[PDB]
């Protein structure tokens, strides 16, 4: 008998660990819009998304008083209606710049000591590639909040297509903590546990059989193992049929799958 197997033509690549966070898209430069007097809002000369310049009149009161923009940028929010009464500490609207986007997140103290300015992240607002963006850590707050045990971390989105990372949006963040580089990646099920050790099966094409090689699992995630040991680029390693195999088992190579990408999982 010859056991049926599928084998992968294994490649060297990158597998990357990450910390899973939540955060918000914000901007570095923004300001609240306050009246200079007390009274009722007569007119609102702004809508969401509108561009306004420093000094420009954005609303009007009856005690006629003008409410003016304090900086130049875009209206991110309006928190007041025509009719409402207001004073110099009523926040009417928010203006901010769209060219100084930032992602804000809060990281637990135990992870902070390995995070550095320049670390890579992926910012996700959705499942598809058009909804994911690259970013880099820009700043680490000196403040530890004692109740939550978290420290604020700021990321700057880079690359192309940032016009869909909209200010105010919720995001998932994948903050890359370690990259295993130039290692053999293979589907996790290739690895088999015998007598408290780990092995894979390498196919010898000439003799149509397998050899049981010991390996070490360096890291694994998303059903992918990065391993070290006696395995090299282009070895044929069994990825279906392995539970039935032993050292020297004879097999039938039913098919050969391509190796997993050399590039990072994330």
Domain with CATH 2.40.30.170 in the chain: 14-31+96-182
Residues 6 or more apart whose CB falls under 8 angstroms from that of 177 comprise: 17, 18, 19, 111, 114, 115, 119
Answer yes or no: are the C-beta atoms of 222 and 264 closer than 8 Å: no
The CATH code for residues 14-31+96-182 is: 2.40.30.170
Q: Outline which parts of the chain fall under CATH 2.40.50.100.
A: 32-95
Which residue, 82, 80, 9, is CA-closest to 43?
Answer: 82
Q: How many CA atoms lie within 13 A of 216 on its CB side?
A: 4
Question: What is the spatial distance between Cα 46 and Cα 212, in angstroms, rounded to a whole number?
Answer: 71
CATH 3.20.190.10 is right for the domain spanning 32-95 = no
Residue ranges matching CATH 2.40.420.20 in the chain: 1-13+183-266
* CA dist 78 → 14, 55, 115 (Å): 46, 17, 36
Q: 141-176 b/e with 16+ CB inside 10 Å = b?
A: eeeeeeeeebbbbbbbbeeeebeebebeeebebbbb
Q: Radius of gyration over alpha carbons of the chain, in Å?
A: 28
**What is d(CA 46, CA 60) in angstroms, rounded to the nearest whole number?**
11
Method used to solve the structure: X-ray
- The DSSP H or E segment spanning 236 is strand 236-240
Parallel, antiparallel, or unpaired: how do β-strands 30-33 and 3-9 relate? unpaired
Q: Which fold has domain 1-13+183-266?
A: 2.40.420
């Amino acid at each position: 008998y010859r056991f049926p197997v599928i084998a992968m033509k294994v490649k060297k690549g990158i597998l990357s660990d990450y910390l899973s966070l939540n955060g918000d898209v914000d901007t570095k430069v923004k300001a609240d819009i306050f009246p200079d007097a007390v009274g009722k809002i007569t007119s609102l000369r702004i809508k969401l998304g509108a561009y306004v310049q420093k000094g420009q009149i954005v609303a009007t009161l009856d005690p006629k008083s003008p409410v003016r923009a304090p900086i130049s940028g875009y209206i991110l929010n309006i928190t007041k209606k025509i009719g409402e009464t207001v004073n110099p500490q009523s926040n009417i609207a928010v203006v901010g710049r769209i060219d100084t986007k930032q992602i804000l997140t809060y990281v637990s103290e135990k992870y902070i000591s390995n995070i550095k300015v320049g670390n890579d992240a992926i910012i996700e607002v959705g499942a598809y590639s058009n909804e994911k963006f690259k970013a880099k850590v820009s700043e680490i707050s000196p403040i530890l909040d004692s109740k939550s045990r978290t420290i604020e971390v700021y990321l700057t989105p880079i690359g192309s297509n940032l016009d869909k990372l909209i200010i105010g949006m919720f995001s998932k963040i994948k903050l890359i903590t370690k990259r295993f580089k130039d290692v053999i990646k293979i589907s996790r099920e290739a690895v088999v546990e015998r007598e408290g050790k780990k092995f894979v099966f390498k196919v010898d094409l000439e003799s149509k059989s397998v050899q049981m090689l010991p390996i070490t699992v360096l890291f694994e995630i998303d059903n992918i193992v990065a391993l070290s040991g006696e395995v090299e680029e282009n070895d044929l390693i069994v990825v279906e049929g392995m539970s039935a195999l032993s050292n020297g088992s004879l097999i039938n190579l039913v098919d050969t799958k391509e190796g997993l990408s050399a590039e990072s999982n994330i």
